[PDB]
Design a protein around this ligand. Structure first.
Ligand code: ZN
Length: 240
RNA sequence: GUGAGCGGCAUCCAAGUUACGCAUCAGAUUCGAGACGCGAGUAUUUCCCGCGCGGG
């Protein structure tokens, strides 16, 4: 899998819609997934409407949308892929905290896309870049493009465990917000400020925003136990 | 063509109501406007201070 639109024909196996124009000009990328639209490929002109708030994330100004993206842009597809992890095998739901911990500590090997909506409904799937290697996971949370490294997540979890192994009252070394919205997101808490060594503080201050967002779900007083998410592509196909 | 470019934390809200610086406490005890200015002592030079003259 190479493009976000590749999930349609590879895990949803949906044939293209009808009434679609056929490109008969010089190739140009899809305005959504940057996929080339060569001669003979089925496309459709852009008709996003006045409620499209993702003009900044458009891959190109070609005003053309491939059929895979047209399938992806359906309301049933948007709602189904709000908290979805699309691997080669199928589509899983990472909405639960345990699923997030499993994904960010024991990721699947194959290429996969990670989606997470920050609101009721958002355009995600055609914006998420593919994660080619599980060591450098690219996560699209709403409008933010996050890079999550599972090794850094594990190291931060170990740092917290060493910090709070003895004290009965568990305290978060770093202030984290699940929405990545608080003005104190990523700042060191007091307990971590005078209970962590210089190296651990330096490591905590030098984590990517995506790692802070992930730890905002995985790092708590009682760490969630990782579990495999349930397959969802059947539900999405049935509702489509 | 710096994962760039583009993007109002913004709108609305009474610190207010009620409350005695007040009650009590000698500026008192002693003592004169009534006393204080020379009619006090001889005759012509003696030791001396400034130097004929000032002066013990
Ligand atoms: Zn596309």
């Amino acid at each position: 899998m190479r493009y976000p639109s590749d999930v349609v024909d590879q895990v949803f196996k949906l044939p293209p819609d009808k009434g679609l124009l056929t490109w008969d000009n010089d190739p140009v990328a899809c305005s959504h997934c940057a996929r080339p639209i060569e001669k003979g490929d089925l496309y459709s002109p852009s008709s996003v409407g006045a409620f499209f708030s993702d003009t900044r994330n458009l891959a190109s100004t070609s005003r053309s949308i491939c059929w895979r993206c047209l399938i992806l842009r359906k309301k049933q597809m948007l709602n189904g892929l709000s908290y979805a992890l699309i691997t080669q095998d199928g589509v899983f739901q990472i909405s639960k905290d345990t699923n997030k911990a499993w994904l960010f500590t024991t990721p699947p090997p194959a290429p996969f896309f990670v989606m997470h909506s920050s609101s009721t409904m958002q355009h995600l799937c055609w914006r998420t870049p593919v994660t080619l290697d599980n060591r450098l996971i690219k996560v699209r949370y709403g409008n933010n493009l996050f890079v999550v490294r599972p090794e850094a997540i594990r190291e931060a979890l170990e740092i917290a465990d060493r910090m709070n192994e003895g004290q009965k009252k568990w305290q978060a070394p770093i202030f984290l917000d699940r929405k990545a919205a608080d003005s104190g997101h990523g700042a060191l808490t007091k307990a971590g400020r005078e209970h962590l060594s210089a190296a651990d503080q330096e490591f905590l201050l030098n984590i990517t925003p995506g790692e802070r967002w992930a730890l905002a779900y995985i790092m708590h007083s009682k760490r969630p136990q990782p579990e495999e998410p349930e397959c969802i592509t059947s539900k999405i196909l049935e509702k489509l």
